[PDB]
């Protein structure tokens, strides 16, 4: 880090160029690493199955146990292997009275990550190549666009964590000043609003069911890794948030939001509806990709003019993913043995506002365009080129000979 006296500079984090290469690099690494792992195309053929029965239980309604014909060894033996999936990777109709199919496989190739590879994010720094530099805004209340009254430069940005998340910025950074709300500057109605807290609130999560693992061999040197028997007392996954701190958090973000919109009402609301990729708060931890009904956490409504009473949210989990919402491609995630516990720091929200109505705003979560995740943390930075050559007058001169 080097701090610069008397420098005023323009940044435009909405148009800043190095988020494009952030997204392009982030997509490519999953693409590059995933390739050698074996594929699930042979299993996509349809299935026959029933209601599952957990140990010492007459029923599990949260489950479906599914029988499938699959090629084994190679092409000249094929067996009626069995496993169980979750309902979200399962659809039913067409063909016959008792048919069942995987959710994405018809439209897209499915791959499971190689089980030894870990999903967990790690800090990555980003450095300019030779002949360039990076600028910051040490300013602690920067809006995001316009000139910046205090600037420093650095070769490499601080470590950033490629956390996959919707509906909540978690395992991220914090603003040093008051809470900052950043939005498109053209019009009152905006594409997305980013609220970035100055104090983190803990989130814990767990999936108490003890999972055990079952394997099926498609390939000649590869294995599909399937989800098998269930063990333990059954519950859904769930997460825990401190209640009173959340009340103060929602009071504070409202208090800042009111400066923009000084009339009396703000209405927060649950998800906008639609498909699951937006309507549930999404993340991953341990080895599986959580989806949470956030609705209970954003039912509050305000008008103008501390380790107890814990709120809990039902949270429900999936194995096949439309990751980065890419056209026609999906990922599969293998199960992990036993229960998994989790902790993380919530840092902000990605919110969206509806078309205005009389004397009432309506704010709810939304957006979820994955570039907003990085735009919420890369707002400080920019990249610029050096031009090392310059010319001037003077009283000097060489000797001619």
């Amino acid at each position, epitope marked *: 880090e080097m701090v610069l006296k008397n420098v005023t500079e323009n940044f435009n984090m909405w148009k800043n160029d190095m988020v494009d290469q952030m997204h392009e690099d982030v997509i490519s690494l999953w693409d590059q690493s995933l390739k050698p792992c074996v594929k699930l195309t042979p299993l996509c053929c349809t299935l026959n199955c029933t209601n599952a029965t957990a140990s010492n239980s007459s029923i599990i309604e949260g489950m479906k146990n599914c029988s499938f014909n699959i090629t084994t060894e190679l092409r000249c033996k094929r067996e009626k292997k069995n496993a169980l999936f979750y309902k979200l990777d399962i659809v039913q109709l067409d063909g016959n009275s008792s048919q069942y199919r995987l959710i994405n496989c018809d439209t897209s190739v499915i791959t499971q990550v190689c089980p030894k590879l870990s999903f967990d994010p790690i800090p990555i720094h980003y450095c300019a190549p030779a002949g360039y530099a990076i600028l910051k805004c040490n300013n602690k209340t920067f809006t995001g666009t316009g000139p910046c009254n205090n600037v420093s430069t650095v070769q490499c940005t601080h470590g950033i964590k490629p956390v996959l998340s919707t509906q909540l910025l978690l395992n991220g950074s914090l603003a040093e000043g008051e809470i900052i709300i950043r939005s498109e500057n053209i019009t009152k109605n905006v594409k997305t609003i980013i609220v970035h807290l100055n104090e983190s609130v803990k989130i814990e999560c767990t999936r108490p069911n003890n999972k055990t693992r079952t394997s099926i061999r498609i390939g000649p040197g590869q294995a599909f890794y399937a989800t098998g028997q269930v063990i333990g007392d059954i519950r859904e996954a769930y997460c825990n948030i401190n209640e009173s701190k959340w009340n103060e958090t929602l009071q504070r973000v409202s208090k800042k939001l009111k400066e923009y919109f000084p009339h009396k009402n703000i209405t927060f609301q649950p998800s906008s509806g639609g498909d699951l990729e937006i309507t549930t708060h999404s993340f991953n931890c341990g080895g599986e990709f959580f989806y949470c009904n956030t609705s209970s956490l954003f039912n509050r409504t305000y008008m103008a003019n501390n380790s107890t009473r814990t709120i809990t949210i039902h949270c429900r989990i999936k194995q096949i993913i439309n990751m980065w919402q890419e*056209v026609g491609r999906a990922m599969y995630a293998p199960p992990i043995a036993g229960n998994i516990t989790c902790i993380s720091n919530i840092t902000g929200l990605l919110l969206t506002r*509806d078309y205005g109505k009389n004397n009432t705003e309506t704010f709810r979560p939304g957006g979820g365009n994955m570039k907003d995740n990085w735009r919420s943390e890369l707002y400080k930075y920019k990249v610029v080129k050096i031009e090392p050559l310059g010319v001037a007058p003077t009283r000097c001169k060489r000797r001619v000979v």
Partner: antibody
Amino acid sequence: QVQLVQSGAEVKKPGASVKVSCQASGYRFSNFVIHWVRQAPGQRFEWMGWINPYNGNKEFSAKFQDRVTFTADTSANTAYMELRSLRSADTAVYYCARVGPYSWDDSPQDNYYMDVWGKGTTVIVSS
Amino acid sequence: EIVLTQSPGTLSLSPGERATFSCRSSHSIRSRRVAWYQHKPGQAPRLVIHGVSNRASGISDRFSGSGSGTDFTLTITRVEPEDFALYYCQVYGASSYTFGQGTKLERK
């Protein structure tokens, strides 16, 4: 309230193409899949396909895939459809539609019933 | 592709009478992925039932439905003058969309 507003009525040439738009209000357009549906006079509705404005994923009835194309724009709050190689059988009323919200208790694609429609648009194939 | 057949083609009733409708199917819909809808000419059509039993938002309690296998039903506890319209059954989802012919509900 929820509403979908459509383009004006069309009378177009045989063998030419017909293009229709469907602009929405009352909700976030980028967050609900959209259907397209047709009805000839006195006949069934015939499903055409669906499009997801969030990601642009598509699925058509294979009967029409050579004939129909969709697209949508988040900044316009509008979905477009394109039907090529018109025939006299294409004379029909056309609709655009919305799905209901997915409760976390639901199973996949249970919400794909028609929650809301537009007022429809008349299309006639004539010289 | 699944084919549906509605009956009766027309039911004539004055206000205050009970109405019951039926929709057949060529294939057994074990999944309850069913829906019933309403249509008047000159107006955008309207949802009634989805998932066999879950009533649409804002619709009166007079409408209700039931069914299983390949025989699916709709009924009205008492008809009122606004309901005079066409009513339609559907199977939907997973590339299996299809519609019936329709049944006309009209004044006796």
